[PDB]
Design a protein around this ligand. Structure first.
Ligand SMILES: [Ca+2]
Ligand SMILES: [Ca+2]
Ligand SMILES: [Ca+2]
Ligand SMILES: [Ca+2]
Ligand SMILES: [Cl-]
Ligand SMILES: [Cl-]
Ligand SMILES: [Cl-]
Ligand SMILES: [Cl-]
Ligand SMILES: [Cl-]
Ligand SMILES: [Cl-]
Ligand SMILES: [Cl-]
Length: 462
């Protein structure tokens, strides 16, 4: 049996990240999870191949969607694992040094808090399981509110931050990762003072976080664990199906599953850089018909026939400059950067703007602008001005990193942003409007859960 020594507990901990890596069943950072995360904003249109993603993209999904179901249950698999470790550690604490106990608890609570965050971010109100039975329990359990789930997540992440080291092996959390995750929960709750409290210190000694000079190093193989990295996942490192082939054009052997919308391209192109060129972030994120655009190591206009010169293609997290194709199986893996320092800077910008330190906020925005070789912020020194560029910089900075939908949602900008993006998607989205909510703002509790758990009420609007 297991649980015998420090090595066994360390192996258990590593296994708690596996549900984030799951490819086909809704693991959060696996290919299908990524699709669900990017599908609902104005970033991309999906083709109608992977039906459960297409319905999500189009706002026609139901509470039987197998992929959103899978996402739900992956979260609970991970919770079961983290709860089990906590229980086993308590049971066996007498054989472990207090230092080892602290290391395990710190990591385990980081992991539990991160998953709890995502659970209530995606499903709003949901059953809150903080104990693990011998088997994952199918006993009935009424939902907890988003606030209560996030309360647990904050408690976990506070304790984690206090116990974790300033540096760690790649894929293992640091105190900075715990603080940054905690800060994000404060941002989502509009607790601006506490966001500032936990995030501002991350910009100072003894931390070493910095924006990398080359934005693209955040999304490559060779600069994994770079100086901007806060927490990264090694997806291939796991009680074949990877991201880049999905988004590459048929012309280079891919499955062309999604393309950037006109609206998102308009956002990328709006403001040119100090030298008059397109924002380097846009040039790292999408391929389109501009002079010198390359795609899989050929000129754009040579890869694509003339009738396709007006199309748009995703580059972020693709092998678009290291390779000429996307073979299957993949030759290498590009870690998912779950948290990076740009996130801390833009979260501070947002917190300071909302609290009323506009100059401070602008300073943080300008760090982001300067890395991208843009002029500094030139909008009015007002909350509304600074908010307009916050939104704009986040859209460009975190394209297809799974932020845009949740951002638009929490800001109350989603409805108007979909309105300008596509008439039919907007029409479908508006069918979800009832009372003062929209049912499409969160994935519904799956039909399977409502059937198996009679104390669970359906999601509002569903
Ligand atoms: Ca199905
Ligand atoms: Ca520490
Ligand atoms: Ca790698
Ligand atoms: Ca439009
Ligand atoms: Cl449709
Ligand atoms: Cl569906
Ligand atoms: Cl390492
Ligand atoms: Cl490393
Ligand atoms: Cl506040
Ligand atoms: Cl296109
Ligand atoms: Cl909205």
């Amino acid at each position: 049996t297991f649980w015998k020594d420090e090595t066994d507990f360390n192996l258990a901990l590593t296994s708690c990240y596996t549900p984030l890596k799951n490819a086909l069943n809704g693991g959060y950072y696996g290919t299908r999870g990524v699709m669900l995360r990017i599908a609902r904003a104005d970033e991309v249109d999906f083709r109608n191949d992977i039906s459960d993603v297409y319905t999500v993209n189009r706002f026609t999904n139901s509470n039987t969607n197998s992929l959103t179901q899978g996402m739900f249950y992956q979260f609970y698999n991970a919770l079961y694992r983290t709860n089990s470790i906590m229980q086993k550690l308590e049971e066996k604490k007498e054989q472990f040094s207090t230092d080892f106990q602290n290391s395990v608890k710190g990591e385990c609570l980081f992991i539990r808090g991160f998953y709890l965050f995502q659970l209530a971010k995606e499903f709003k109100d949901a059953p809150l399981r903080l104990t693990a039975s011998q088997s994952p329990s199918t006993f009935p359990l009424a939902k907890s509110s988003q606030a209560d789930i996030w309360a647990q997540a904050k408690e976990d992440l506070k304790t984690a931050a206090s116990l974790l080291p300033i540096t760690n092996k790649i894929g293992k959390p640091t105190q900075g990762a715990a603080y940054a995750a905690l800060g994000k929960i404060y941002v989502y709750e509009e607790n601006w003072q506490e966001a500032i409290n936990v995030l501002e210190p991350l910009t100072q000694n003894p931390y070493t976080y910095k924006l990398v000079e080359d934005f693209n190093w955040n999304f490559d193989d060779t600069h994994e664990n770079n100086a901007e990295s806060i927490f990264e996942l090694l997806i291939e490192d796991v009680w074949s199906n990877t991201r880049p082939k999905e988004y590459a054009a048929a012309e280079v052997g891919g499955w062309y599953e999604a393309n950037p919308t006109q609206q998102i391209m308009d956002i990328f192109w709006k403001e040119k850089d100090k030298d008059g060129n397109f924002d380097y972030r846009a040039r790292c994120s999408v391929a389109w018909d501009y002079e010198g655009c390359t795609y899989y190591q050929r000129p754009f206009r040579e890869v694509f026939a003339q009738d396709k010169w007006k199309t748009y293609w995703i580059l972020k997290y693709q092998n678009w400059k290291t390779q000429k194709d996307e073979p299957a199986p993949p030759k290498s893996f590009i870690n998912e950067r779950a948290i990076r320092y740009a996130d801390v800077l833009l979260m501070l910008a947002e917190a300071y703007m909302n609290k009323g330190a506009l100059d401070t906020s602008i300073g943080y925005i300008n760090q982001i602008r300067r890395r991208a070789n843009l002029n500094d912020y030139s909008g009015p020194i007002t909350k509304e001005g600074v908010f307009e560029d916050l939104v704009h910089q986040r859209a460009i900075e975190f394209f297809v990193e799974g932020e845009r939908f949740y951002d638009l949602r929490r800001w109350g900008l989603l409805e108007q942003t979909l309105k300008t993006c596509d008439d039919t998607r907007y029409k479908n989205y508006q069918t979800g409007k009832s009372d003062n909510i929209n049912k499409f703002n969160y994935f519904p509790i799956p039909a399977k859960e409502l059937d198996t758990n009679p104390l669970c009420t359906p999601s509002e609007g569903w």
